[PDB]
CSV table of C-alpha atoms in Angstrom, one decimal:
chain,number,residue,atom,x,y,z
P,1,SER,CA,6.5,51.6,52.9
P,2,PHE,CA,7.5,48.1,54.0
P,3,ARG,CA,9.8,45.8,52.0
P,4,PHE,CA,8.6,42.2,51.4
P,5,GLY,CA,10.7,40.4,48.9
P,6,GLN,CA,10.6,42.6,45.8
P,7,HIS,CA,7.2,44.2,46.5
P,8,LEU,CA,6.6,47.3,48.6
P,9,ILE,CA,3.7,47.0,51.0
P,10,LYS,CA,1.9,50.2,52.0
P,11,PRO,CA,1.6,50.7,55.8
P,12,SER,CA,-2.2,50.9,55.2
P,13,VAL,CA,-2.1,47.1,55.1
P,14,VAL,CA,0.6,46.6,57.8
P,15,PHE,CA,-1.1,46.2,61.3
P,16,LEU,CA,2.0,45.6,63.5
P,17,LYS,CA,5.7,46.5,63.3
P,18,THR,CA,8.0,45.7,66.1
P,19,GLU,CA,11.6,46.3,66.7
P,20,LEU,CA,12.6,43.7,64.1
P,21,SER,CA,9.4,42.4,62.5
P,22,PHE,CA,6.2,43.4,60.8
P,23,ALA,CA,2.8,41.9,60.1
P,24,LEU,CA,0.5,42.2,57.1
P,25,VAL,CA,-2.9,41.3,55.8
P,26,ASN,CA,-3.0,39.0,52.8
P,27,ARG,CA,-4.1,40.2,49.4
P,28,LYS,CA,-5.6,36.7,49.0
P,29,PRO,CA,-6.0,34.9,52.4
P,30,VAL,CA,-6.5,31.2,52.2
P,31,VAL,CA,-9.0,31.6,55.0
P,32,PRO,CA,-10.3,34.6,56.9
P,33,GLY,CA,-7.7,36.3,58.9
P,34,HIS,CA,-4.9,34.6,57.0
P,35,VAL,CA,-2.1,37.0,57.9
P,36,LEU,CA,1.7,36.9,57.5
P,37,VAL,CA,4.5,37.8,59.9
P,38,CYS,CA,7.9,38.6,58.4
P,39,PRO,CA,11.3,40.0,59.5
P,40,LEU,CA,11.8,43.6,58.4
P,41,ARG,CA,15.2,42.7,57.0
P,42,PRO,CA,14.8,41.0,53.6
P,43,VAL,CA,16.4,37.5,53.7
P,44,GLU,CA,15.2,34.6,51.7
P,45,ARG,CA,15.9,31.7,54.1
P,46,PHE,CA,15.3,31.1,57.8
P,47,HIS,CA,18.9,30.2,58.7
P,48,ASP,CA,19.8,33.8,57.6
P,49,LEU,CA,18.2,35.5,60.6
P,50,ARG,CA,20.4,36.4,63.4
P,51,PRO,CA,19.1,34.9,66.7
P,52,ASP,CA,17.3,38.1,67.8
P,53,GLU,CA,15.3,38.4,64.5
P,54,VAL,CA,14.2,34.9,65.3
P,55,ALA,CA,13.1,35.5,68.9
P,56,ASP,CA,11.4,38.7,67.6
P,57,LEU,CA,9.8,37.0,64.5
P,58,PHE,CA,8.2,34.3,66.7
P,59,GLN,CA,7.3,36.4,69.7
P,60,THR,CA,5.5,38.7,67.3
P,61,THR,CA,3.9,35.6,65.7
P,62,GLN,CA,2.6,34.5,69.1
P,63,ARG,CA,0.9,37.9,69.6
P,64,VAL,CA,-0.6,38.2,66.1
P,65,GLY,CA,-1.9,34.6,66.2
P,66,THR,CA,-3.8,35.4,69.3
P,67,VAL,CA,-5.3,38.6,67.8
P,68,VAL,CA,-6.6,37.0,64.6
P,69,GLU,CA,-7.8,33.9,66.4
P,70,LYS,CA,-9.9,36.2,68.6
P,71,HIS,CA,-11.0,38.8,66.1
P,72,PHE,CA,-11.8,36.1,63.5
P,73,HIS,CA,-13.4,33.7,66.0
P,74,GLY,CA,-11.2,30.6,65.5
P,75,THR,CA,-10.6,28.0,68.2
P,76,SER,CA,-7.0,27.0,67.0
P,77,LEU,CA,-4.3,28.5,64.8
P,78,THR,CA,-2.1,26.9,62.1
P,79,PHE,CA,1.4,28.3,61.8
P,80,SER,CA,3.5,27.4,58.8
P,81,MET,CA,6.8,28.6,57.3
P,82,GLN,CA,7.7,27.5,53.8
P,83,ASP,CA,11.4,27.8,54.0
P,84,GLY,CA,12.9,27.7,50.5
P,85,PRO,CA,11.9,26.9,46.9
P,86,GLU,CA,11.3,23.1,47.4
P,87,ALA,CA,9.0,23.8,50.4
P,88,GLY,CA,6.7,26.3,48.6
P,89,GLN,CA,8.4,29.7,49.0
P,90,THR,CA,7.1,31.9,46.1
P,91,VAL,CA,8.0,35.3,47.4
P,92,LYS,CA,11.6,35.1,48.6
P,93,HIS,CA,11.4,36.6,52.1
P,94,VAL,CA,11.1,34.7,55.4
P,95,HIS,CA,7.5,34.6,56.3
P,96,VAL,CA,5.1,32.7,58.7
P,97,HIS,CA,1.5,32.2,57.6
P,98,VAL,CA,-0.9,32.5,60.5
P,99,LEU,CA,-4.4,31.1,59.8
P,100,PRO,CA,-7.2,31.1,62.4
P,101,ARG,CA,-9.0,27.8,62.7
P,102,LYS,CA,-12.7,26.8,63.2
P,103,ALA,CA,-14.6,23.7,64.0
P,104,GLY,CA,-14.7,21.7,60.8
P,105,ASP,CA,-13.5,24.9,59.0
P,106,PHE,CA,-11.8,23.1,56.1
P,107,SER,CA,-10.2,35.9,46.1
P,108,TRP,CA,-8.4,39.4,45.7
P,109,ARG,CA,-8.9,42.3,48.0
P,110,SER,CA,-9.0,46.0,47.2
P,111,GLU,CA,-6.2,48.1,48.6
P,112,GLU,CA,-8.9,49.9,50.7
P,113,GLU,CA,-10.7,46.7,52.0
P,114,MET,CA,-7.4,45.2,53.1
P,115,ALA,CA,-6.7,48.7,54.5
P,116,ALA,CA,-9.9,48.0,56.6
P,117,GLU,CA,-8.9,44.6,58.0
P,118,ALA,CA,-5.6,46.3,58.9
P,119,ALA,CA,-7.2,49.1,61.0
P,120,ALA,CA,-9.4,46.6,62.7
P,121,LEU,CA,-6.4,44.6,63.6
P,122,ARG,CA,-4.2,47.4,64.7
P,123,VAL,CA,-6.7,48.1,67.5
P,124,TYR,CA,-5.9,44.9,69.5
P,125,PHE,CA,-2.3,46.0,69.6
P,126,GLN,CA,-2.5,48.6,72.4
T,1,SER,CA,13.2,10.8,80.3
T,2,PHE,CA,11.6,13.8,78.5
T,3,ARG,CA,7.9,14.7,78.9
T,4,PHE,CA,5.9,15.2,75.7
T,5,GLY,CA,2.2,15.5,76.3
T,6,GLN,CA,1.3,12.4,78.2
T,7,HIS,CA,4.1,10.1,76.8
T,8,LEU,CA,7.6,9.9,78.2
T,9,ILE,CA,10.3,10.0,75.5
T,10,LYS,CA,13.5,8.2,76.2
T,11,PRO,CA,16.7,10.4,75.9
T,12,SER,CA,17.9,7.8,73.3
T,13,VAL,CA,15.6,9.4,70.8
T,14,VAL,CA,16.2,13.0,71.9
T,15,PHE,CA,19.1,14.6,70.0
T,16,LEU,CA,19.1,18.1,71.4
T,17,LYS,CA,18.0,19.8,74.6
T,18,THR,CA,18.6,23.4,75.3
T,19,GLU,CA,18.0,25.6,78.2
T,20,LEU,CA,14.2,25.5,77.6
T,21,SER,CA,13.6,23.2,74.6
T,22,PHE,CA,14.2,19.7,73.3
T,23,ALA,CA,14.1,17.9,69.9
T,24,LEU,CA,13.1,14.4,69.0
T,25,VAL,CA,13.0,11.9,66.2
T,26,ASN,CA,9.6,10.9,65.0
T,27,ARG,CA,8.3,7.4,65.6
T,28,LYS,CA,6.6,7.8,62.2
T,29,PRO,CA,8.2,10.6,60.1
T,30,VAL,CA,6.1,11.9,57.3
T,31,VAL,CA,9.3,12.2,55.3
T,32,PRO,CA,12.9,11.4,56.1
T,33,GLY,CA,14.3,13.5,58.8
T,34,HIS,CA,10.8,14.6,60.0
T,35,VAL,CA,11.7,15.8,63.5
T,36,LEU,CA,9.8,17.8,66.2
T,37,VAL,CA,11.0,20.6,68.4
T,38,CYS,CA,9.0,21.2,71.7
T,39,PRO,CA,9.2,23.3,74.8
T,40,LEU,CA,10.4,21.2,77.8
T,41,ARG,CA,7.5,22.6,79.8
T,42,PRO,CA,4.3,20.8,78.9
T,43,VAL,CA,1.7,23.4,77.7
T,44,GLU,CA,-0.9,22.6,75.1
T,45,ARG,CA,-1.2,26.0,73.3
T,46,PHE,CA,1.3,28.4,71.9
T,47,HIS,CA,0.0,31.5,73.7
T,48,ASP,CA,0.9,29.7,76.9
T,49,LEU,CA,4.7,30.0,76.5
T,50,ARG,CA,6.4,32.8,78.2
T,51,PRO,CA,8.4,35.0,75.7
T,52,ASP,CA,11.7,33.3,76.5
T,53,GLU,CA,10.4,29.8,75.8
T,54,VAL,CA,9.3,31.2,72.5
T,55,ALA,CA,12.7,32.7,71.6
T,56,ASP,CA,14.2,29.4,72.7
T,57,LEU,CA,11.7,27.2,70.9
T,58,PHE,CA,12.3,28.9,67.6
T,59,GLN,CA,16.1,29.6,67.9
T,60,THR,CA,16.4,25.8,68.5
T,61,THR,CA,14.1,25.2,65.5
T,62,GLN,CA,16.4,27.2,63.3
T,63,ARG,CA,19.4,25.1,64.4
T,64,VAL,CA,17.7,21.8,64.0
T,65,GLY,CA,16.2,22.6,60.7
T,66,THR,CA,19.6,23.3,59.3
T,67,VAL,CA,21.0,20.0,60.6
T,68,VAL,CA,18.2,17.8,59.2
T,69,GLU,CA,18.2,19.6,55.9
T,70,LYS,CA,22.0,18.9,55.7
T,71,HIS,CA,22.2,15.4,57.1
T,72,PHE,CA,19.0,14.3,55.1
T,73,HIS,CA,20.1,16.2,51.9
T,74,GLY,CA,17.0,18.5,51.4
T,75,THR,CA,17.2,21.9,49.6
T,76,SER,CA,14.4,23.6,51.7
T,77,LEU,CA,12.5,23.0,55.0
T,78,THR,CA,8.9,23.1,55.9
T,79,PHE,CA,8.1,24.3,59.4
T,80,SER,CA,4.5,23.9,60.8
T,81,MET,CA,2.9,24.2,64.2
T,82,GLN,CA,-0.6,22.8,64.6
T,83,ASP,CA,-1.7,25.0,67.4
T,84,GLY,CA,-4.8,23.5,69.0
T,85,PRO,CA,-7.5,20.9,68.3
T,86,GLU,CA,-9.1,22.5,65.2
T,87,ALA,CA,-5.7,22.9,63.6
T,88,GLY,CA,-4.6,19.3,63.9
T,89,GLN,CA,-3.0,18.9,67.4
T,90,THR,CA,-3.3,15.3,68.4
T,91,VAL,CA,-0.7,15.2,71.2
T,92,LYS,CA,-1.4,18.2,73.4
T,93,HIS,CA,2.0,19.8,73.7
T,94,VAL,CA,3.3,22.8,71.7
T,95,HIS,CA,5.5,21.3,68.9
T,96,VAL,CA,6.9,22.3,65.6
T,97,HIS,CA,7.3,19.8,62.8
T,98,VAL,CA,10.5,20.3,60.8
T,99,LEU,CA,10.6,18.3,57.5
T,100,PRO,CA,13.5,18.5,55.1
T,101,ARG,CA,12.5,19.1,51.5
T,102,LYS,CA,13.7,17.8,48.1
T,103,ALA,CA,13.4,18.6,44.5
T,104,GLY,CA,9.9,17.2,43.6
T,105,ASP,CA,10.1,15.3,46.9
T,106,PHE,CA,6.3,15.1,47.3
T,107,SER,CA,5.9,3.5,58.9
T,108,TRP,CA,6.9,2.8,62.6
T,109,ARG,CA,10.4,2.7,63.8
T,110,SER,CA,12.1,0.5,66.4
T,111,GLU,CA,13.2,2.1,69.6
T,112,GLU,CA,16.8,1.2,68.6
T,113,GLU,CA,16.6,2.5,64.9
T,114,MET,CA,15.2,5.8,66.1
T,115,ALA,CA,17.9,5.6,68.7
T,116,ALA,CA,20.3,5.5,65.7
T,117,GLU,CA,18.9,8.5,63.8
T,118,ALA,CA,19.2,10.3,67.1
T,119,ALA,CA,22.9,9.6,67.6
T,120,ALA,CA,23.6,10.5,64.1
T,121,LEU,CA,21.9,13.8,64.7
T,122,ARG,CA,23.5,14.6,68.0
T,123,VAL,CA,26.8,14.8,66.2
T,124,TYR,CA,26.1,18.0,64.3
T,125,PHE,CA,25.3,19.7,67.6
T,126,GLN,CA,28.9,20.3,68.8
C-alpha cells in the first residue's frame, strides 16, 4: 500500500498519513512504541525533500511522538534520523525513528500484531 | 546575544539565524562539525513549538546539515534530538545535533577558535 524504500508497507501497519508523510509501526522496534515517520515520496537523502515535505515530515513527527510517548507511557522521546550510508541508513528512504523514553529505560512481530499496535495508535489521531 | 536554555551564546559563535531559529557551533563537538540547531524561543520540549517553529527548525536543519557535511567533508549526516530528561536532554531547550559522517568515522574550544569555525560557516549561507 505505502512505499518505503523498496518494500511495500500494508496500510494495516500504517497509523497516520498526512498530506505529504506517513507513519508506521516497526517490524522490530528497538523499544516499545519505536515507530518511524517517513515522507511519502521515496528519496534517500534529507537534502532531497522540498521545503514543504520537510515542514510536513517534522510537524507529523511532533504529533506522533506525543502519541507514542502517551500510549506507551514514556516521559521523554528520542528522535533520530540516520541520513545516509555512513550514518546508518539501511533502507534508503528518509525516515525519523521516534522512540518513547522511560526512567532508566535503557524481536519480530506478526503482520497481525503490528496490525494491532497500528489500530491502537490510529485512535489518538482524531 | 542568543538565549539557549540558561546560557547566553555570543553571536560570534552563531553562524545562522532565521526567522524563528538559530544555529551554533559546539563548545565540545562529539565529532568535527558537530553543530546544534535550536528554536530562538526557549522551550524545553518539542511538543511546545507551534507548528511554524517546527517547519522552521527543521528546514534550517536541512540547510545547516548540508553545509557542515560539505565544509567538514562527510558523506552522510546524523540528526538527533534528545527530547526530554529520560532521553538525554541536559540543557533544557529544544535542540537538534547535526554531526557530519565519514567512511568508518566512528575537547573544549576557545571563544575565539569557535568564533573561527563560525565565520567559516557563515560563508556558505549567502
